[PDB]
Symmetry: C3
Subunit: 312 residues, 3 copies
């Protein structure tokens, strides 16, 4: 069983970013560009080893149709075993966090055409992951990333999650703890933990999801100042034949973060539709609004885009 | 429909470059090396979407057998749609220019073993391209590359071309306009335009081609000095069973270019033969001469090479 | 004939390195990490050209499951022809040396979990290689790497080897000569030659091998000081059903090398077992000890590891 698979997706996006600083406009920048929406190519396989035991492997790469990427195995890549005991994998693996929701189902490159801000702590990392068998809707996962694989200024990290599925209803949890975390521009953070909870309903013609996410850590400053951030995101989609409109809203609460991201409070909505020419090929259109102000020092972004997506 | 394809081609080249500066020899350099002639590997597919409509995609990479290249999609890569209306593609795409002739059919790495100088403004770039259906020999193409995709010192660019084909006879035109163009070592240029016209006869046992190319631009110097260059290239090939000798001649007229390329006037001839072991596998041999002097400050290059090429 | 193939292999290794400097411990460092053991993906093909003649090609890349590698064709990649006359290849090719033994059959990333030190002069390089047909157990190889392909501070190099095989018994020889060789940190060397001889017995259930390796060169210092190094390695394996324990010992003699590698004298043993779930999938475990001291300034390393390997 050796399979070549991938997703090719690209389109065009335009956007406009406005800083109001109580004087109305202080800055206006625009952007209009053809962009890749995250095209990828992978190789994978499995082998039946008998007694229900299986070998599994995958080597998956970024393959932007812009021709900008390079690297083998820089997307999710692993080897492992799977059988009655569950599934054990090693390699460059999604964090449990990254697998908890499909919290950002938008194919977009602009940060205003998807629910990107809440998705940002998601990552792949070199680690070991155990995924349990499913028993009556319930499964779980534990994952560990060693201190040596993390680098000089990054500690080991612990990851856990559980999932429940019954019919179209689901709830997923995922969390992580990290002793030392490098922030590249600013002061680093310690005792970082993130927790995410998602619940919704998923099937044909009806998709709904709501997610809340909490991050906490201590700043490596003169006082070990606590930092925290809370974010919620909800999306709703409904399929009419070949067309599926969806809408997303996300909100970031005013949180104690040193970074100038920072996050300050934000609100965003993304709106759009997919048109399916087939089960593998879809056209995409979307539009988005984001405000990171208070009403006074507003940052207002608008954007729109169209795209094409093909799976194979 | 998911296809893996490619061209593997390599050989060995030797060359000798002589600067005469009215004293006869001022410099003599030589080069003898095993070289890759542009090996490549790609993935592509299409899907019938019904009503004669189709999804198309390709991800194509450099894959030198020297093992020097890296990158996904750094050759022609795209997604698009094709149907009765014609063909629309987006991604890293050949400029119309690059598709107008097969002006340099030589597989070579040395600049003296192919018609390389005239081919140099050819490129791939991130853009949108529309290719029309063919009606009684006639088709056309328009292509646009956005200012944001081009970089900070490069403007948007416009590309157009038309083709005519009837039996073995063809004529192809291709042009481009670019408001701002960065030249890396020298002063940048503005209002750059290039036009190329090619006509010839192509089939089994008889290939002939002649091409003329004109470039014009304004120099970003103290006076907006006009710059221009004109070049012609002709090649002739004839197949005797398994062997196909061909010869090329190219001439660059003495043109107003600031660059020390510059181009000054040049003449070159390339001579060679392909031997086909099969429809996919060919042996290659070639030899070349180039003079970039006036007769006084001559630069004289000679070269030879042998190679092997396999398509799959 | 177009084939996609590869080896995916990864596991976890722990090690501990101790410097004794007559005071007992001066330094103790440890390392525990998930690691890729040299995963790779390749494309290859051949075409029957008639009369027993064949075209052959391969493009093979590193593809670490850590996601750290990049490059096409950065493992063994070539094009060539094969027929009654033998086999002729061009491209990035194993040196004859690298093909003489399977002197280090350990999949390991730590230098203490394989016979790595003796294997270090092995390399791939851009070159031409001729491999003879086999006549009554005997074959040979000659290989040449041009001065231009080698770089500015590296000369051309000559490679030769012969092989004998009869039943499970083999003897292999491989050597190389290199006029100028750059050493990156230290003084460069000249008139470098390496010779390796390996003999052993190989089949089902019984593998034995012994190898001796000699290197000589002149140092580009004030006196053209001679430098030399001698190393021996032996390994023994026996298969019991699905399990195959093996052991290796290697010794480096006290040799005249300027480098602080340097090599000083060393002894090492590696011990381990492969468990085969199938002909393509194997679990691995190993442990290793190395001493680079004299008894006084000892460097003592221990290590252990477990891994999984799948071929396709």
């Amino acid at each position: 069983d050796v399979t070549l698979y991938g997703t090719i997706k690209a389109g065009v996006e335009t956007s406009r970013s406005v800083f109001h600083q109580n004087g109305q406009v202080t800055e206006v920048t625009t952007a209009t560009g053809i962009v890749d929406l995250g095209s990828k190519i992978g190789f994978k396989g499995q082998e039946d080893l008998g007694n229900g035991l299986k070998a599994i492997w995958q080597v998956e790469q970024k393959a932007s149709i812009a021709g900008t990427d390079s690297g083998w195995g820089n997307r999710q890549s692993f080897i492992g075993l799977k059988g009655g005991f569950g599934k054990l994998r090693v390699g460059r693996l999604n964090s449990v966090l990254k697998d908890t929701g499909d919290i950002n189902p938008w194919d977009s490159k602009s940060d205003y055409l998807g629910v990107n801000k809440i998705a940002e702590p998601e990552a792949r990392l070199i680690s070991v992951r155990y995924d349990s068998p499913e028993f009556a809707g319930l499964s779980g996962s534990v994952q560990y990333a060693l201190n040596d694989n993390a680098g000089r200024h990054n500690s080991e990290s612990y990851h856990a999650g559980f999932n429940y599925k019954n019919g179209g209803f689901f709830v997923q949890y995922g969390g992580a703890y990290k002793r030392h975390h490098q922030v590249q521009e600013g002061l680093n953070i310690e005792k970082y933990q993130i927790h995410r909870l998602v619940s919704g309903y998923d099937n044909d013609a009806l998709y709904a999801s709501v997610a809340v996410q909490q991050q906490d850590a201590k700043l490596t400053d003169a006082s070990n100042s606590h930092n925290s951030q809370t974010e919620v995101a909800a999306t709703l989609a409904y399929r009419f034949g070949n067309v599926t409109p969806r809408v997303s809203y996300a909100h970031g609460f005013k949180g104690l973060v040193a970074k100038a991201d920072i996050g300050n409070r934000y609100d965003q909505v993304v709106v759009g539709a997919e048109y399916d020419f087939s089960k593998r090929t879809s056209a995409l259109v979307s539009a988005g609004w984001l405000q990171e102000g208070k009403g006074e020092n507003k940052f207002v972004a608008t954007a729109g885009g169209v795209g094409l997506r093909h799976k194979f």
